[PDB]
Write an enzyme that holds these catalytic residues in place. Structure first.
Site: not given
Ligand SMILES: [Ca+2]
Length: 346
Positions: A127, A179, A215, A246, A248
């Protein structure tokens, strides 16, 4: 299970901080991990400050989890060596610390060396790109980079280069990833990601791949945009790997300008709703886009961000309920699970 259907890692984030989701205490979750996945990411306990007890390194709790993985059929993706959020910054990671650059070096050298041979891959830097949704101190962009304590101290993005070289030197066997989130949207942040990665390539930095957190919501961003964003990064290099880190999927979208299309009650998608059926198609199309755009070589894995819905950081968001993962509250597989099965198998 799922992992049998692929020749790249199929992983899950696991909790280890007490509560119902803690993998050490929940045999039901342990059983799902052993049946379905072949990699874990620590949801929390491999963040930066978790490597210390007072001013000393302490690897006790993370060693326990890494050992558990080795005993239960799982490789480990390390999350994460460098990351800005103050909740997980080591106390050395401060503009008040004259010894910053040395303590930074000691961090990466010590942690990466410690886990050598035990951890397959790392989020080396997480990030590093600016995001307005994500700027609580109102610092603003520096040409697309986040002005985190690492950026401020180094006077620029050189900390990224250094983190990667140090990690490579400390553990030459690990796959090293950069990432970030929202880079699948194919907008401004994706462009900033291109800039960041290209600069690392130009500098000869030992970055092995890029992580997309993924996400996402059921209908935003569009799959065409997700597909193109990945394509843009794949095109930067003949060897750069892509990992979904990650994943979802939120049924509810509070950012679409329409507040009439939310499921507002926990009972809404308890059993069946249009949303869980779309979620199946959504997991399926994303795992399809990944396969279609990332060549086999270059596929570092797909990981979902938790086992069961009530474990998710998005179980509630914006004071609304959501059902983001592959297993429900009773730890039964959802249509989402089937969507992944269908995608993996062709
Ligand atoms: Ca909405």
């Amino acid at each position: 299970g799922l992992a049998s259907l692929a020749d790249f890692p199929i992983g899950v984030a696991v909790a280890a901080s007490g509560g119902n989701a803690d993998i050490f205490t929940s045999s039901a979750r342990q059983n799902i991990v052993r049946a379905e996945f072949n990699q874990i990411t620590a949801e929390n306990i491999m963040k930066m400050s978790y490597m210390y007890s007072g001013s000393n390194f302490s690897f006790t709790n993370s060693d326990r989890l890494v050992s558990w993985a080795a005993q239960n059929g799982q490789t480990v993706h390390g999350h994460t060596l460098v990351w800005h959020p103050s909740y997980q910054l080591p106390n050395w990671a401060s503009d008040s610390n004259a010894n910053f650059r040395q303590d930074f070096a000691r961090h990466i050298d010590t942690v990466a060396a410690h886990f050598a041979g035990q951890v397959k891959s790392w989020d080396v830097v997480n990030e590093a790109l600016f995001d307005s949704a994500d700027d609580p101190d109102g610092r603003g962009s520096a040409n697309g980079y986040r002005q985190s304590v690492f950026y401020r101290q180094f006077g620029g993005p050189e900390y990224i280069d250094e983190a990667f070289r140090r990690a490579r030197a400390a553990d030459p066997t690990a796959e090293l990833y950069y990432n970030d989130f929202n880079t699948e949207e194919n907008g401004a942040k994706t462009t900033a990601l291109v800039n960041l990665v290209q600069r690392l390539l130009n500098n000869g930095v030992p970055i092995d791949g890029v992580g997309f957190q993924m996400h996402v919501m059921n209908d935003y961003p569009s799959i065409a945009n997700i597909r193109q964003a990945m394509q843009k990064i794949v095109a930067l290099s003949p060897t750069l790997k892509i990992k979904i880190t990650e994943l979802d999927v939120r049924l509810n979208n509070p950012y679409d300008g329409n507040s009439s299309n939310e499921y507002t009650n926990r009972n809404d998608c308890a059993v069946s709703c249009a949303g869980l059926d779309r979620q199946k198609a959504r997991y399926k199309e994303i795992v399809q886009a990944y396969l279609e755009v990332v060549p086999p070589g270059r596929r570092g894995g797909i990981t979902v961000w938790g086992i069961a819905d009530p474990d998710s950081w998005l179980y509630t968001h914006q004071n609304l309920p959501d059902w983001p993962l592959l297993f429900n509250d009773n730890l039964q597989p959802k249509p989402a699970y089937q969507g992944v099965v269908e995608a993996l198998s062709g």
